Protein backbone atom coordinates (compact mmCIF):
# COMPACT_ATOMS: atom_id res chain seq x y z
CA UNK A 1 0.00 0.00 0.00
CA UNK A 2 1.13 3.78 -0.71
CA UNK A 3 -1.09 5.00 1.79
CA UNK A 4 -3.41 3.75 4.37
CA UNK A 5 -5.24 6.07 7.28
CA UNK A 6 -7.74 4.84 9.76
CA UNK A 7 -10.72 7.52 9.57
CA UNK A 8 -14.18 7.45 11.62
CA UNK A 9 -16.94 7.32 9.30
CA UNK A 10 -20.02 6.25 11.61
CA UNK A 11 -19.40 7.43 15.00
CA UNK A 12 -20.44 4.87 17.61
CA UNK A 13 -22.16 7.20 19.60
CA UNK A 14 -24.76 8.25 16.64
CA UNK A 15 -27.06 5.22 17.28
CA UNK A 16 -29.31 6.57 19.20
CA UNK A 17 -31.93 4.07 18.37
CA UNK A 18 -29.98 1.11 19.13
CA UNK A 19 -27.70 -0.07 21.66
CA UNK A 20 -23.93 0.04 20.59
CA UNK A 21 -22.08 -0.49 24.36
CA UNK A 22 -23.56 -4.32 24.84
CA UNK A 23 -22.04 -5.82 21.93
CA UNK A 24 -19.45 -7.76 23.79
CA UNK A 25 -18.07 -11.66 24.15
CA UNK A 26 -15.31 -13.40 26.30
CA UNK A 27 -14.52 -14.83 23.33
CA UNK A 28 -12.69 -11.59 22.77
CA UNK A 29 -11.09 -10.42 26.28
CA UNK A 30 -9.20 -6.96 26.97
CA UNK A 31 -8.37 -6.23 30.62
CA UNK A 32 -10.05 -9.01 32.07
CA UNK A 33 -13.26 -7.67 30.60
CA UNK A 34 -15.22 -8.90 28.21
CA UNK A 35 -14.71 -6.88 24.87
CA UNK A 36 -14.88 -6.88 20.58
CA UNK A 37 -14.06 -6.14 17.76
CA UNK A 38 -12.38 -2.20 18.10
CA UNK A 39 -13.18 -1.05 14.13
CA UNK A 40 -16.92 -2.47 14.19
CA UNK A 41 -20.01 -2.34 16.23
CA UNK A 42 -22.00 -5.48 17.33
CA UNK A 43 -25.39 -3.18 17.51
CA UNK A 44 -27.92 -5.18 19.99
CA UNK A 45 -31.69 -3.85 20.49
CA UNK A 46 -32.61 -1.42 22.20
CA UNK A 47 -35.62 -1.95 24.71
CA UNK A 48 -36.98 -5.01 22.71
CA UNK A 49 -37.01 -3.56 19.63
CA UNK A 50 -34.26 -3.18 16.80
CA UNK A 51 -36.00 -0.47 14.48
CA UNK A 52 -34.67 -0.58 10.41
CA UNK A 53 -31.49 0.96 10.15
CA UNK A 54 -30.92 2.79 7.13
CA UNK A 55 -27.13 4.81 7.35
CA UNK A 56 -25.90 6.09 4.42
CA UNK A 57 -21.99 7.10 4.17
CA UNK A 58 -20.39 9.62 1.47
CA UNK A 59 -16.76 9.14 0.19
CA UNK A 60 -15.92 13.02 1.07
CA UNK A 61 -12.19 12.15 1.09
CA UNK A 62 -10.20 12.38 -2.45
CA UNK A 63 -8.75 8.59 -2.33
CA UNK A 64 -10.52 4.87 -2.12
CA UNK A 65 -11.59 3.86 1.51
CA UNK A 66 -11.74 -0.02 2.39
CA UNK A 67 -14.78 -0.24 4.08
CA UNK A 68 -15.74 -3.86 6.38
CA UNK A 69 -18.84 -4.57 8.10
CA UNK A 70 -20.05 -8.31 9.20
CA UNK A 71 -22.95 -10.14 10.20
CA UNK A 72 -23.89 -12.42 13.63
CA UNK A 73 -25.25 -16.30 12.70
CA UNK A 74 -26.78 -16.88 16.00
CA UNK A 75 -27.12 -20.38 17.53
CA UNK A 76 -30.91 -20.63 17.53
CA UNK A 77 -34.30 -18.39 16.79
CA UNK A 78 -34.16 -17.88 21.16
CA UNK A 79 -30.65 -16.35 20.75
CA UNK A 80 -31.96 -14.40 17.70
CA UNK A 81 -35.31 -12.93 19.69
CA UNK A 82 -32.86 -12.18 22.50
CA UNK A 83 -30.52 -10.13 20.67
CA UNK A 84 -32.39 -8.48 17.85
CA UNK A 85 -35.67 -9.07 19.01
CA UNK A 86 -37.10 -9.30 14.73
CA UNK A 87 -37.27 -13.21 14.10
CA UNK A 88 -36.59 -12.60 10.32
CA UNK A 89 -33.31 -10.21 9.42
CA UNK A 90 -31.65 -9.18 6.47
CA UNK A 91 -28.54 -7.00 6.30
CA UNK A 92 -28.39 -4.75 2.48
CA UNK A 93 -25.94 -2.79 1.32
CA UNK A 94 -25.46 -0.57 -1.59
CA UNK A 95 -22.42 1.41 -3.58
CA UNK A 96 -22.77 1.89 -7.28
CA UNK A 97 -21.63 -1.62 -7.93
CA UNK A 98 -22.53 -3.30 -4.56
CA UNK A 99 -25.57 -5.19 -4.75
CA UNK A 100 -25.95 -7.13 -1.44
CA UNK A 101 -28.30 -8.49 0.79
CA UNK A 102 -26.96 -10.78 3.56
CA UNK A 103 -29.33 -13.01 5.60
CA UNK A 104 -28.37 -14.27 9.10
CA UNK A 105 -28.04 -18.38 8.60
CA UNK A 106 -28.71 -20.71 11.95
CA UNK A 107 -27.21 -23.85 12.32
CA UNK A 108 -26.21 -25.63 15.51
CA UNK A 109 -22.56 -25.59 15.68
CA UNK A 110 -18.96 -26.36 17.93
CA UNK A 111 -18.03 -23.93 20.48
CA UNK A 112 -14.95 -22.20 19.44
CA UNK A 113 -13.12 -20.34 22.29
CA UNK A 114 -16.68 -20.27 24.03
CA UNK A 115 -19.34 -19.40 21.24
CA UNK A 116 -21.22 -21.81 18.96
CA UNK A 117 -22.42 -17.61 17.02
CA UNK A 118 -20.74 -17.15 14.13
CA UNK A 119 -19.59 -13.58 12.49
CA UNK A 120 -19.33 -13.56 8.61
CA UNK A 121 -17.02 -10.05 7.82
CA UNK A 122 -17.35 -8.76 4.36
CA UNK A 123 -15.70 -6.09 2.82
CA UNK A 124 -15.74 -3.30 -0.20
CA UNK A 125 -13.56 -0.53 -1.78
CA UNK A 126 -15.43 2.84 -1.69
CA UNK A 127 -14.51 5.05 -4.53
CA UNK A 128 -14.26 8.82 -3.48
CA UNK A 129 -17.46 10.57 -4.60
CA UNK A 130 -19.47 7.16 -4.07
CA UNK A 131 -21.63 6.34 -1.30
CA UNK A 132 -22.23 3.22 0.54
CA UNK A 133 -25.95 2.47 1.85
CA UNK A 134 -26.66 -0.18 4.63
CA UNK A 135 -30.18 -1.41 5.59
CA UNK A 136 -30.50 -3.49 8.54
CA UNK A 137 -32.93 -4.77 11.01
CA UNK A 138 -30.91 -7.20 12.46
CA UNK A 139 -27.50 -9.25 12.58
CA UNK A 140 -25.67 -6.35 11.78
CA UNK A 141 -22.16 -5.67 12.87
CA UNK A 142 -21.50 -2.13 11.52
CA UNK A 143 -18.51 -0.34 10.77
CA UNK A 144 -17.37 2.47 13.07
CA UNK A 145 -14.00 3.26 11.30
CA UNK A 146 -12.83 2.62 7.85
CA UNK A 147 -9.62 2.55 5.65
CA UNK A 148 -8.28 5.54 3.31
CA UNK A 149 -6.19 3.25 0.51
CA UNK A 150 -3.98 4.05 -2.68
CA UNK A 151 -2.45 1.44 -4.41
CA UNK A 152 0.52 2.34 -6.65
CA UNK A 153 1.88 -1.64 -7.01
CA UNK A 154 1.38 -5.17 -5.39
CA UNK A 155 3.81 -7.63 -4.10
CA UNK A 156 2.60 -10.43 -1.43
CA UNK A 157 2.60 -11.98 2.56
CA UNK A 158 5.59 -13.01 3.50
CA UNK A 159 5.47 -15.76 6.09
CA UNK A 160 8.40 -15.51 8.62
CA UNK A 161 8.81 -15.84 12.28
CA UNK A 162 11.81 -13.20 12.07
CA UNK B 1 -42.31 -20.68 -20.96
CA UNK B 2 -40.93 -23.47 -22.49
CA UNK B 3 -37.85 -23.96 -25.21
CA UNK B 4 -37.17 -26.84 -27.27
CA UNK B 5 -33.64 -26.75 -29.34
CA UNK B 6 -34.79 -27.93 -32.58
CA UNK B 7 -31.31 -26.75 -33.89
CA UNK B 8 -28.25 -29.16 -34.79
CA UNK B 9 -25.72 -27.30 -33.03
CA UNK B 10 -25.88 -25.53 -29.22
CA UNK B 11 -27.50 -22.56 -28.60
CA UNK B 12 -26.06 -19.51 -26.11
CA UNK B 13 -29.22 -18.16 -24.28
CA UNK B 14 -29.10 -15.05 -22.45
CA UNK B 15 -32.03 -13.71 -19.59
CA UNK B 16 -31.72 -11.58 -16.36
CA UNK B 17 -33.09 -10.35 -13.55
CA UNK B 18 -34.43 -6.74 -12.40
CA UNK B 19 -32.89 -6.05 -8.84
CA UNK B 20 -35.41 -2.58 -8.01
CA UNK B 21 -34.60 -0.20 -5.25
CA UNK B 22 -37.68 -0.13 -2.90
CA UNK B 23 -40.63 -2.36 -2.43
CA UNK B 24 -42.98 0.74 -4.18
CA UNK B 25 -40.70 -0.35 -7.21
CA UNK B 26 -41.25 -3.62 -7.06
CA UNK B 27 -44.99 -3.49 -6.85
CA UNK B 28 -45.12 -0.60 -9.35
CA UNK B 29 -43.40 -2.44 -11.85
CA UNK B 30 -44.24 -6.38 -11.10
CA UNK B 31 -46.94 -6.05 -8.88
CA UNK B 32 -46.57 -9.33 -6.46
CA UNK B 33 -44.42 -7.98 -3.64
CA UNK B 34 -42.18 -11.36 -3.27
CA UNK B 35 -41.05 -12.70 -6.41
CA UNK B 36 -38.94 -15.23 -8.00
CA UNK B 37 -37.41 -16.37 -11.79
CA UNK B 38 -36.17 -20.44 -12.26
CA UNK B 39 -34.51 -21.74 -15.06
CA UNK B 40 -34.16 -25.07 -15.75
CA UNK B 41 -31.93 -27.29 -18.42
CA UNK B 42 -31.16 -31.00 -18.24
CA UNK B 43 -27.93 -29.38 -16.33
CA UNK B 44 -29.13 -26.33 -15.39
CA UNK B 45 -31.43 -26.26 -11.45
CA UNK B 46 -31.07 -22.16 -10.90
CA UNK B 47 -33.89 -19.78 -8.78
CA UNK B 48 -32.67 -16.23 -8.83
CA UNK B 49 -34.72 -13.53 -6.54
CA UNK B 50 -34.48 -10.08 -6.52
CA UNK B 51 -32.41 -8.06 -4.40
CA UNK B 52 -33.42 -4.76 -2.95
CA UNK B 53 -30.66 -2.46 -1.83
CA UNK B 54 -30.32 1.46 -2.02
CA UNK B 55 -27.98 2.49 -4.75
CA UNK B 56 -25.92 4.71 -6.40
CA UNK B 57 -27.43 6.18 -9.56
CA UNK B 58 -25.29 5.44 -12.65
CA UNK B 59 -26.29 6.67 -15.80
CA UNK B 60 -29.64 7.98 -13.76
CA UNK B 61 -30.04 4.30 -12.14
CA UNK B 62 -30.14 3.07 -8.63
CA UNK B 63 -31.83 -0.17 -9.92
CA UNK B 64 -29.58 -2.96 -11.25
CA UNK B 65 -30.03 -5.48 -14.16
CA UNK B 66 -27.98 -8.78 -13.36
CA UNK B 67 -27.28 -11.27 -16.87
CA UNK B 68 -26.95 -14.67 -16.81
CA UNK B 69 -26.21 -17.21 -19.40
CA UNK B 70 -25.98 -20.74 -20.92
CA UNK B 71 -25.36 -23.38 -22.94
CA UNK B 72 -28.02 -25.14 -24.59
CA UNK B 73 -27.25 -28.49 -26.06
CA UNK B 74 -28.96 -30.22 -29.52
CA UNK B 75 -32.84 -31.34 -28.42
CA UNK B 76 -32.58 -30.35 -24.59
CA UNK B 77 -35.22 -27.65 -23.65
CA UNK B 78 -35.01 -24.78 -20.98
CA UNK B 79 -37.87 -23.92 -18.67
CA UNK B 80 -38.48 -20.15 -17.37
CA UNK B 81 -40.99 -19.90 -14.53
CA UNK B 82 -41.03 -16.03 -12.89
CA UNK B 83 -43.84 -14.45 -11.08
CA UNK B 84 -41.80 -11.09 -11.76
CA UNK B 85 -38.33 -8.92 -12.41
CA UNK B 86 -37.79 -11.06 -15.67
CA UNK B 87 -35.96 -9.88 -18.50
CA UNK B 88 -36.28 -12.73 -21.26
CA UNK B 89 -34.92 -14.12 -24.05
CA UNK B 90 -35.71 -12.81 -27.38
CA UNK B 91 -32.94 -13.73 -29.33
CA UNK B 92 -30.43 -16.43 -28.50
CA UNK B 93 -26.89 -17.37 -30.48
CA UNK B 94 -26.09 -20.74 -32.19
CA UNK B 95 -22.60 -21.77 -31.43
CA UNK B 96 -20.30 -24.02 -33.01
CA UNK B 97 -16.67 -24.01 -30.84
CA UNK B 98 -13.71 -25.84 -32.85
CA UNK B 99 -11.01 -24.20 -30.89
CA UNK B 100 -10.28 -21.36 -28.44
CA UNK B 101 -7.99 -17.81 -28.56
CA UNK B 102 -8.16 -14.67 -25.86
CA UNK B 103 -9.68 -11.62 -26.21
CA UNK B 104 -7.25 -8.45 -27.64
CA UNK B 105 -6.84 -5.18 -26.17
CA UNK B 106 -6.32 -2.84 -29.39
CA UNK B 107 -7.11 0.80 -30.48
CA UNK B 108 -6.22 -0.24 -34.01
C1 LIG C 1 -21.34 12.56 -2.40
O1 LIG C 1 -21.20 13.94 -2.08
C2 LIG C 1 -20.74 14.76 -3.16
C3 LIG C 1 -20.54 16.16 -2.61
O2 LIG C 1 -21.75 16.51 -1.92
C4 LIG C 1 -21.86 17.93 -1.70
O3 LIG C 1 -21.19 18.35 -0.51
C5 LIG C 1 -21.66 17.64 0.65
C6 LIG C 1 -20.83 18.06 1.86
C7 LIG C 1 -23.15 17.91 0.85
O4 LIG C 1 -23.36 19.31 1.08
C8 LIG C 1 -23.93 17.51 -0.39
O5 LIG C 1 -25.32 17.81 -0.27
C9 LIG C 1 -23.34 18.24 -1.60
O6 LIG C 1 -24.01 17.83 -2.79
C10 LIG C 1 -21.76 14.67 -4.30
O7 LIG C 1 -21.27 15.35 -5.46
C11 LIG C 1 -21.96 16.60 -5.65
O8 LIG C 1 -23.26 16.42 -6.21
C12 LIG C 1 -23.98 17.65 -6.30
C13 LIG C 1 -25.40 17.38 -6.78
O9 LIG C 1 -25.98 16.36 -5.95
C14 LIG C 1 -23.24 18.60 -7.24
O10 LIG C 1 -23.91 19.86 -7.28
C15 LIG C 1 -24.20 20.24 -8.64
O11 LIG C 1 -23.46 21.39 -9.03
C16 LIG C 1 -23.60 21.64 -10.43
C17 LIG C 1 -22.66 22.78 -10.83
O12 LIG C 1 -21.39 22.57 -10.19
C18 LIG C 1 -25.05 21.96 -10.76
O13 LIG C 1 -25.20 22.06 -12.19
C19 LIG C 1 -26.02 20.91 -10.22
O14 LIG C 1 -27.37 21.39 -10.29
C20 LIG C 1 -25.69 20.54 -8.77
O15 LIG C 1 -26.04 21.61 -7.90
C21 LIG C 1 -21.82 18.83 -6.77
O16 LIG C 1 -21.10 19.59 -7.75
C22 LIG C 1 -21.11 17.51 -6.52
N1 LIG C 1 -19.82 17.79 -5.92
C23 LIG C 1 -18.71 17.11 -6.22
C24 LIG C 1 -17.44 17.65 -5.62
O17 LIG C 1 -18.72 16.12 -6.94
C25 LIG C 1 -21.98 13.22 -4.69
O18 LIG C 1 -22.98 13.16 -5.71
C26 LIG C 1 -22.40 12.40 -3.47
N2 LIG C 1 -22.59 10.97 -3.71
C27 LIG C 1 -23.46 10.49 -4.59
C28 LIG C 1 -23.74 9.02 -4.51
O19 LIG C 1 -24.07 11.18 -5.40
C1 LIG D 1 -37.21 -31.60 -27.97
O1 LIG D 1 -37.90 -31.98 -29.15
C2 LIG D 1 -37.46 -33.20 -29.74
C3 LIG D 1 -38.23 -33.37 -31.04
O2 LIG D 1 -39.62 -33.19 -30.74
C4 LIG D 1 -40.48 -33.71 -31.76
O3 LIG D 1 -40.71 -32.76 -32.81
C5 LIG D 1 -41.24 -31.52 -32.32
C6 LIG D 1 -41.35 -30.53 -33.47
C7 LIG D 1 -42.59 -31.78 -31.64
O4 LIG D 1 -43.51 -32.29 -32.60
C8 LIG D 1 -42.42 -32.79 -30.52
O5 LIG D 1 -43.68 -33.10 -29.91
C9 LIG D 1 -41.80 -34.06 -31.09
O6 LIG D 1 -41.58 -35.01 -30.05
C10 LIG D 1 -37.69 -34.33 -28.73
O7 LIG D 1 -37.13 -35.55 -29.22
C11 LIG D 1 -38.17 -36.45 -29.65
O8 LIG D 1 -38.81 -37.10 -28.55
C12 LIG D 1 -39.91 -37.91 -28.98
C13 LIG D 1 -40.64 -38.46 -27.77
O9 LIG D 1 -40.96 -37.38 -26.88
C14 LIG D 1 -39.38 -39.03 -29.88
O10 LIG D 1 -40.48 -39.81 -30.37
C15 LIG D 1 -40.28 -41.20 -30.10
O11 LIG D 1 -40.09 -41.95 -31.30
C16 LIG D 1 -39.69 -43.29 -31.02
C17 LIG D 1 -39.35 -44.00 -32.32
O12 LIG D 1 -38.57 -43.11 -33.14
C18 LIG D 1 -40.80 -44.02 -30.25
O13 LIG D 1 -40.32 -45.30 -29.84
C19 LIG D 1 -41.27 -43.23 -29.03
O14 LIG D 1 -42.48 -43.78 -28.52
C20 LIG D 1 -41.48 -41.75 -29.36
O15 LIG D 1 -42.65 -41.59 -30.16
C21 LIG D 1 -38.63 -38.46 -31.07
O16 LIG D 1 -38.01 -39.53 -31.80
C22 LIG D 1 -37.57 -37.47 -30.61
N1 LIG D 1 -36.99 -36.84 -31.78
C23 LIG D 1 -35.70 -36.55 -31.89
C24 LIG D 1 -35.26 -36.05 -33.24
O17 LIG D 1 -34.91 -36.69 -30.97
C25 LIG D 1 -36.99 -34.00 -27.42
O18 LIG D 1 -37.27 -35.04 -26.48
C26 LIG D 1 -37.45 -32.65 -26.89
N2 LIG D 1 -36.81 -32.20 -25.67
C27 LIG D 1 -36.84 -32.89 -24.52
C28 LIG D 1 -36.38 -32.16 -23.30
O19 LIG D 1 -37.27 -34.03 -24.44
C1 LIG E 1 -39.75 0.76 26.63
O1 LIG E 1 -40.90 0.58 25.79
C2 LIG E 1 -42.12 0.55 26.54
C3 LIG E 1 -43.27 0.07 25.65
O2 LIG E 1 -43.17 0.63 24.33
C4 LIG E 1 -42.33 1.94 27.14
O3 LIG E 1 -43.56 2.00 27.87
C5 LIG E 1 -41.16 2.29 28.06
O4 LIG E 1 -41.31 3.64 28.53
C6 LIG E 1 -39.81 2.10 27.36
N1 LIG E 1 -38.70 2.18 28.30
C7 LIG E 1 -38.28 3.33 28.85
C8 LIG E 1 -37.10 3.21 29.77
O5 LIG E 1 -38.82 4.40 28.62
Known amino acids: ?79 QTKLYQNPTTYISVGTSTLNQRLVPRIATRSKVNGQSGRMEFFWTILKPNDAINFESNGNFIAPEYAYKIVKKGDSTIMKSEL
Open 1 to 79: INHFEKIQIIPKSSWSSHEASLGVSSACPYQGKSSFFRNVVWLIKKNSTYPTIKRSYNNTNQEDLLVLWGIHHPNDAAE
